[PDB]
Structure formats: structure tokens, C-alpha cells
Subunit: 231 residues, 6 copies
């Protein structure tokens, strides 16, 4: 494959998908037994290790739907991945959410043309695999984590033209903004595999607040634990 150079059995069927290749490294080193790097092309780190005697992989996807789609396609179609859990950060767009809240994306809105191209002006809703969603939720519950299940926005545009770019979305119940989930949910459905996006609130886009570095790591770790128990 042009983007992941690894032999065909190097990647586990269950895989975590941070955007940041360094977070992949971080996850492999801190939560997996015997993590072995399988990819370095474009610095996009991927590792395979074990969790409770089962193989788990972790692969950076980069930012945005076009980048993540590349890795997801290759993982599913070339490496046989079946359970794909994105673990990431998001910006909250409602005051009802607080920093360090966990968001489990039931579905993903988008401003990408990904589905407009294919459904030609009809509306396709990219969704999480229910069983995975339900599990993550109960895992988060058992740990007493503040968790919300609902809509996220997958945007192509981190930096906006004008202010209040997310006002309409929030008025329609969207919880948070990130850049990958709509791509993951769409491709998982196309391929008949199972997917979930879990997110940690790092920035509040309404209150202006941002978490401190240590606060991120603490809740990030919790998120990883949920993700691993969700598999």
C-alpha cells in the first residue's frame, strides 16, 4: 500500500485511531503490552501490541476527512481491520458541555462534500455502530465520567471566515466540533465494518476556555481506557 508499509498480518482487527501519530506512540507505549511499530511512512506512526491477551493496533490518521479516509480505506481493505475506534479531542460548541467532558459521537454532521458527491443532494447520516456506542457509554458510566452521547460536527475548516461559525449547528443540538468522524462512519458503513468515535473536550469554543496540559493527559488516559474496554 502506498501509505502504510507493513506486511499483511501486522495490523490487528481492532484498532484505535488518534489523529496525531505521536498520540498513537503515546497510546502504544502506555497502554499496550509489547507494542511493535509497523509503519513510519509520512511519520504516520502505527503500532500493534496486546491488551488482555488480545491484539490491538493504534494508527495515526492525520487531520481531516481526506487524510483519515486514506488510512481507514487501507486498514479495512488491505489489512482486514473490523473494529475501528477513533479517540480524539473536540471543541465544545454548547455551554451544556464542560471541559474534560467525554463525548461519544452517535452520529457525525459534516461540511465535507464526501456524501454530497455520492448521494447528490440527498442527506446521508453517518452513524456509530450501536453495540460499540452502548458499550463505551456503560464503561464511561461505571467510571463516573461526565459523558454525553450525541451529534458532532466533522468540519473541513478549522479556521473560519467569520465569527460564530458553529451557531446554527449548536441550535440544532450538535455538541462538539472535530474533523474525522463523518469520514470514519461513512467508510465503516460502506465496508460493513464497525466503528466508533470517542472524544475528549479540550477546548470550549463558546467560553474560550482551554484545558491545562496535565488535565488533558488525565482525561485522555480515561478515554483510552474506555476505548480499550469497548473492543
Amino acid at each position: 500500500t502506498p501509505h502504510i508499509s507493513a506486511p499483511p498480518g501486522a495490523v490487528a482487527e481492532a484498532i484505535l485511531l488518534p489523529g496525531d501519530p505521536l498520540r498513537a506512540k503515546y497510546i502504544a507505549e502506555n497502554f499496550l503490552e509489547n507494542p511493535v511499530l509497523y509503519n513510519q511512512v509520512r511519520n504516520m506512526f502505527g503500532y500493534t501490541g496486546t491488551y488482555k491477551g488480545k491484539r490491538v493496533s493504534v494508527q495515526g490518521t492525520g487531520m481531516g476527512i481526506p487524510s483519515a479516509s486514506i488510512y481507514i480505506h487501507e486498514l479495512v481493505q488491505f489489512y482486514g481491520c473490523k473494529t475501528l475506534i477513533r479517540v480524539g479531542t473536540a471543541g465544545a460548541i454548547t455551554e451544556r458541555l464542560k471541559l474534560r467532558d467525554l463525548v461519544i459521537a452517535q452520529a457525525a454532521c459534516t461540511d465535507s462534500s464526501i456524501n454530497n458527491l455520492r448521494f447528490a443532494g440527498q442527506n446521508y447520516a453517518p452513524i456509530a455502530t450501536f453495540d460499540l456506542l452502548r458499550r463505551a457509554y456503560e464503561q464511561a458510566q461505571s467510571r463516573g465520567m461526565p459523558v454525553h452521547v450525541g451529534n458532532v460536527l466533522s468540519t473541513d475548516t478549522f479556521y473560519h471566515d467569520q465569527p460564530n461559525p458553529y451557531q446554527l449547528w449548536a441550535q440544532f443540538g450538535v455538541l462538539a466540533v472535530e474533523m474525522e468522524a463523518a469520514g470514519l462512519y461513512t467508510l465503516a458503513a460502506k465496508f460493513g465494518v464497525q466503528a466508533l468515535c470517542i472524544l475528549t473536550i479540550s477546548d470550549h469554543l463558546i467560553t474560550g476556555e482551554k484545558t491545562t496540559p496535565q488535565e488533558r493527559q488525565e482525561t485522555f488516559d480515561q478515554m483510552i481506557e474506555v476505548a480499550l474496554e469497548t473492543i
Copy 2:
């Protein structure tokens, strides 16, 4: 209100929403204590009764997003309804589903312009209220009913131009076709209320099969029981 003529406290905050006004009558008469009709305008029957000492209403919506939107708007904005559960039939579009399967709509795709008008070519995903979804699922589980949680299509078009109209949708994991859920999910989110669509598979649009009348009533009743326990 032009479409529901009832005094302001006649409708319960929790309400079931069949498309067929006669099914509303059927539900009120068979599952509620002391059902009292509150509306007859356009023959669109609505009733209020009790279930386990709590008020529940049941209101026919008619067919299609424009019709249902009218009633839903009036129920939420004029009558204070907060928990809205659509109970209906759907046509299966995947062989993985069988007749009499229960479908709980996690989200609703659409070919309506409802959201194109508002989001102007961006993609909004109308979704169920998670807590309601999760409850219905566990209720259905406890009864050993065959149940699927996932995507439905809310179409404007019952009768299609050409054959295989649902092939692309099915290839993207959509389970079943009906005509209201995308409207309900969108408006519930706009108003900040809670909503769920539960469906019974009456027709299989791939296998051509249709259920017998008695088979419908039997599984229909089960669906109503789930809906009532979901409130």
C-alpha cells in the same frame, strides 16, 4: 391552533406518534386507561389516557415530513410535549432484516429538502435522543424481540420513478424506509425536546414479502409495549 383544536392542558408531555389516526385510536383503546379524544380536525385523531398512573397522549401525524412537522410543531410549541415517540411501520431494504423485525432509528437519512434549506448543502444528521434509544433497546431485549438499531431513510417518495430506488442507501447500511423520522428528529433537536422513532417491519422491499394482517397486530402490540415502557 389551526390543526389541533384542544384546550392547552389536554395533551400529555409524553406522546406516541403513529402516522395513521386510526392506529392512534387503536393504541388509546387497547393500551391506555380512560382514553379521552382531544382532537378530530382533519380526522387526525388524538387521545389522552394514562399508563401506570402517568398521562400519555397519542396523536396521528399523517404521512410525510410536511404533515408530521405540522403536528409536531403544534404539540411541542403549543401543547408543551417533551417526549415524542413515533411508532410506525417501515419497509426493510436489506435481507439482513426479516419481516416483524423491530427497528429503532439511531438516525434518519432523508431525501427531503427540510435541512438543505437550512444548512445550505452542509450535512446535518437527525438523531434519536440516546437515553430513549438505549431504553427501548433494553426493553426489546428483555422481551427477546428481534431488534436492530441503526439508520432509516425518511423519504418524500413512496412510489419511485425507476426500480432499485434504495440500492445506494442499503449499500451504506440503511436498514429500512419510512416517511417521518427525519422531520421528528430535526424538530425535536431545534426545540430542545426528546424524541425516538420505533418501527415494525411490515414489508420487505427486497424479498417482496408482506406480513399477514394478524402478524402485524401481534408485533405492533409488542412495539407499543416497548414504546410505553420507554417513556
Copy 3:
């Protein structure tokens, strides 16, 4: 059919199409000889009787393009209807129109996706059958009725977000708003049959004025008379 349960001979070639099935009842009882009900499915009354020795049917369609298309499709394809006349009410969006004016829809604008889906972004203009339009206009003339012939908007959206939702339409000469005509006109052309939409202004959406129940009854009766003579 799933929606009209009658033998193929029960429905006449010429049919009136109110939105309200109770107005179907009113029409049939007060204007047809020997009116006989042929449909009760979903409380959507349809009747067949005679006018001046010839059979005429009257069928409720429900509200909105998706509901009305179901009935229209079945009437044309399963029952052999060839002359379809919508009779209904509308809200005026221009001060030129006064309450109780008759509007004959020469064409129908829409915010529905019905044709966008079909003509992919090109513009199709749904129109009345000219011969019917001309005859209806002459019938209204002959009664000294204030009548306008022109554009109406068929909307999916009864309740609007923002104020002044119709001002652009009005600026472009659109007379009144209702919810079905674009559907009727598009399907009639698709099937090669004849259609017209006649409307009475029951509400003024600019002045906020409204008609008394007695007032709409009297002009409604006059409209029915026009429609019956147009057949």
C-alpha cells in the same frame, strides 16, 4: 393499494382533491347525487357520486407533497383517474389579493426536493392543464367572483423559523401559499393526465387577517361549483 382500499370501478375518471377528508365528506354530501364512500383507510375519506348525470369522485389527500403524491399516484395508476382538480385554501402573500379571492394556479413554485431530485439542479415548472385553467377562469368570471390566475408556492414548511418567509416569492409575483399543487402538477405531467388547482384565500399572511367560518363556507361552496363546472 396500501392507501385506498376500493375495487377499480368505484372511483370516477374525474376527481376533486381536497386536503381535508372531512371536506371530502362535505363536498360529496352537499354537491353530488348519491354519494357513496369507497375509502376509509387512515381516515382518508373518498366518495363517488354523480354531477349532472356523470360520475365524480372526491378524495382527501392529506397535507404536503409526500402525502398527496401517494393518493395521486394511486388514483392515476390504479384507478384510471384522468381529470384531477385540487380544491383547497391558501394564505395570500400579496396585498393585491384580498380574503375570499379565488386563486387559480397557473403554475406552482416549491421548496420541496421533488424535482431537484429528478432534474438535478435544473428548473422544471409544474403547470396546470391550460384547458381546465381557462374553463375555471370563465366559470369564475360568470359568477362575478374576484379571481386571480398565476403562481402559488407549494411549501413543505407550514411553520417558519424567521419572520417574512414569503417576501422573495411575493417580490416575484407569487400570489399565495399552500402545500400540494407542485406535486399534483408534476405527477399529472409525468402520467399524461389533466390537473388544476383552485384555491380560496382563507388567510392573509401579510395583513394577518382571517375569515369567519361562515365566510369561508360561502366562498368555498362557490369554488366547488366552479370546479364541478370545469370537469
Copy 4:
């Protein structure tokens, strides 16, 4: 006014609109009393003369909505024109029409972006002023001319990328294709003035037949007569 250089008053309220400036010359030289050329800018001939005691003007529009729009706008906004009748040829796209048939455009479909830009994906139907449509039809009737009243398509594209480009339009009852009507009807509505488009079938885009030069002049003469009597 850049595109028409004439003093105010040199143009009559009532005006015929051929696409071809030389057909304008023909009209003024053969049907109008004391024709006076009021415009030569860009070879786009415009004349004023008299017909049966009233001034009538005739102005070439060029081909296409963008061209005709320029002239229509200036005529209406700068010169005070109130009644605008396009006279032209069209290609028939249904075998129902024979060569030399007269078509009176009740409405005009389009593949231009003229209204898409303005109504952002909502569908506006550009229509003829009913009074002119009605008078034109009666004029044709009493002359015994074969005449059809219905939809035309105003295309941006004379020469098409693929074959059978008019197949979908024809299936939805569209009669003929030309290039200006939708712009005329839209601008007339915008400006609150009156318009009609009358066309003779010079080409049959289905049978591949064409009229002889003698037949064109003959039926073209009849059309002008109808238009002048309609005006």
C-alpha cells in the same frame, strides 16, 4: 443606457422581442406603419412604428438569457415598457407537435442559474401573464392555427455534450426548446410588468425534420399577427 442609445419616449409601452435583430427589421418593415429605427448599438436593431392607432416597438434581444436580460432590463427600467411579447422559433421535443405548430409558453423551464442564484435551490416557476396568454390563444383559435399551450425549456446550451438531451423534459410534458423565455418571464415578474412568449416550430428535434424557408416566412407572418392582436 449603454446597450440601447435612444432618447426616452422613442420606445413604446408595447414591444415585440425577436432574438434576431434582422427579424426585428422584417417585422417593422412589414407590419408597422412609419417604422423608425431607434437603435443601432451592437447591430441590435430596435424600431418604433404604429399598429391600428397605437405605437408598437420591436427590439432584437440576441440569443440566451444573459443577452435578452440586458435588453429586457433596459427596455423596462429605462424606457418604460409594460407589455413585452417574445416572438421566436423553437425545436419541438415531442412527436405531438408537428412542424409549423404555434406554441404559447404558459411557463418556462430552464437549465440557467438565473433563479438558483436567487432562490438558492428552491424552485421558482417563470410564467406568462395569463391575460396575454388567454388573448394569444383566442387569436390563434379564430385563425384556425394549430396551437399548443404548455411548458417550454429555456436552455443555455444550443449544442449538447450528449445525445437525447431533452428526453427527461419531454417525459414531463415540455413541448419545445428555445433560449430566452425564462429570463423574460422572471424579469417581467420582478418588474411588475406583463409578458408572453409565442413560438413557431421550425425544427423537430425528435423526427429530425425541418421547415423550408417558404414555410418559415408563412407561419412566422401568422405569429406576428397574433402577437400584434394580443398586444
Copy 5:
């Protein structure tokens, strides 16, 4: 060929394309040796003459993409034209441009549906043949003429519904507005032939300035020279 009635061979491979047929006349009478009028159909003058030992033609296109497309198609497909250079005027939409500036269109933005229809909402960029763009620029440079190379907008709409209609285009670096370039560049690419659009600023749509008639002739002369040397 309906729109140009000339024998094959009467038109040279290299051709200038003014919008105005009378500007074609001016070009042929002032710059070409032994100019011969080859077309009079619709007053759309087309000439062939010689320039420095080679045949050069000059053909009026009319205004707008639909009009120019007709001529461009016939010229290329029926007469064998290979090098097509539009020469015209434009309105400047940025204060960076002064009156009488020369603009060479590297690409052409548009609000026409020409490509939307073809690429269904994907974005195609119509561009100049680089070799002609490069030669035209060098010709202008050595004459010391103030010249800009960048985007123009080919609009369908001379007269706009609202004020500041070019504000967004200008913010994205668009230099000037005209009405044909995008059609020319698109058709040239489709046909595998070579094209350029060169324009002089006659109007400043920001400052509201205009050139005198003497200034127009002067800078227009320079433009033609550049074009003939580019060809």
C-alpha cells in the same frame, strides 16, 4: 451551420472574438489586409483578412456564455478554428486596477450553470492556454502597457438585484467582470483547441469612473495589436 453561413475555408484557424459585431467590423477595417465579410446572419459580422502574411478572422460573439458558446462551437467544430482570442472590455472590481489597464484572464470564474450541469457540483477551473497567456503578457510588457494577469468573472447578470454584487469575488482576488471568458475557456478545453481572453478596463465598478470615448478607442487599438501579435 445555422448561425454562420459561410463555405468551409472562409474562416481562418486563428480568430479574434469581440462581443460586438461592429467592433469586429472596426478590427477588420483597421488591422486586416483585404478584409472579406463572410457572415451576415443575425447581424453578427464575421470577417477574414490577412495580418503579416497569415490569414486572421474576426467574429462577433454577442453577449453572454449561451450566445458566445454557439459561435465558438460552430467556429471550432464546423470551420476548423484552433486559436481563439477574445478581445473585450471589463468592469474593474478592485481599486488596484485603474481605467485603461489591460487584463489577461489566466482563468475565469462564473455564476453560469455551464459546468455545474456537467460536473454536478464539483469545481472545474476554466483556464487560458498558457502559451498564449505568456505571449500576450510579453507583448504588453514591451509596449509598456499597464497589465494584470489573474482571475476574471464571467457573469450571466449585467444588472444586479442588489448592490456590491462583486464584493466576495474581489476579496478572493478577482480582477474584473465580463460575460464570455468561462464559456470560451471551457469549450476550448473540451475541443482540444487554444484560447485566450484579453480585456481592457473601460469601467471601474468600485470608483464609479468611466473612460471617455477617445480613451476607449486608444487602449482598444493597443489591445488588438497585442492579440494579433499573440496569435
Copy 6:
């Protein structure tokens, strides 16, 4: 910035923009004097060094418009970059192009929503800064390099559903496919800065041919030399 952690003075005004951060490393180490890393966030290497006594930076952008827009936005708005040159690889979609050809993007087509969101259905053409384009072309000439100047497609979609996904683009003269240029060109115009995209054909998407690692290295080096001389 969230994505580039460097003080404002560490980045040069003139910057090269590979997609691959390892190619950023390669460029900096082999073509710049005193290369110094300024960024490691998300493994997206950026370096600053000198070329012929002047500072030049080199920054990985990642793949796709959304990823590259993040970097471009930050470089321009936070670091004061004014000359941005993308250097990358592309797949040829025409037989005219051969492996190892240099392509200089005069403009960039796209299937991204980036501009649709902004210009709502109108067509904006993202273009190169002409001065850079011209200089890069001359640099390539001077090395006897096979070079083409024209259109590229910036796609969101590396892996396609159907075969022959690029044939319409090619039929319209598009040379090659990559994933960033439309983003770069649009943002550079938005911000009033200067940009260019130079590409080497590493793959042929028609013949299915591919280059050896040695082959792409040698022509890649030549491209870098062109880019450095273009600054």
C-alpha cells in the same frame, strides 16, 4: 498555534510546502544551508535554513485540503509567510503526460466543498500567482525538463468507488491529480499572498505505470531546484 509551535521569527517569508514531513526533512537537509527544525507537533516537521544567503522554510502540510489549510492559515496569519510553494507528486490522467514530467498548476479544480460553502454554487477558479508560474516555467525550460502548465484536480478522495473516476476531468484538459493545490490557491488569494504548486508525475493513472525510487528522487531534486530558483 495549536499546530506549529515556534516563535514568530523562526519561519521565513518564503516557504516550500511538501505534503510529507519526511520530504520536508529531505529538502532541508539536502538543499538548504544550516537547516534548523522549528516544529515537531504531530510529527509535522518544519525547518528553516538559507538558500543563496536568504532564509527559506520548508513545512510538511499533510494530505488533503483540510490538513493543508490548517498549516497554510497559520503560516500566513501567525508567521507572516508571503511566498508559498507547494512541491509534491501527482498522478497523470492523460496519455500526453509521461512519468517524470513536471507539472506547474496554473489553476486547480476540486471536488472539495471549500468554495461551494463560500460562493454558494457559483464557480471560483483557484489560480497560481502568475509571476511565480512564469518564473518556474522558465527555470524548467532552462534545464531542458519536460514541463506542462495547466489544470490539476485537487481531490478529497484518494480511493475511488468506480473505475475511470478521472475521465471527465481529462476530457476537459485536466493534467494530473493531487490533493492540496485548490486549498493553497484559495487561501493565498483570500490572504493576498503569493503561491504556486509544482508537481512531479510519479504515477500514471491511465497506463497504470509507476516510477522507481531512484527515478522519483532524481526528478524530485530537479523540482526542488526549480522551486528554490522561483522564490
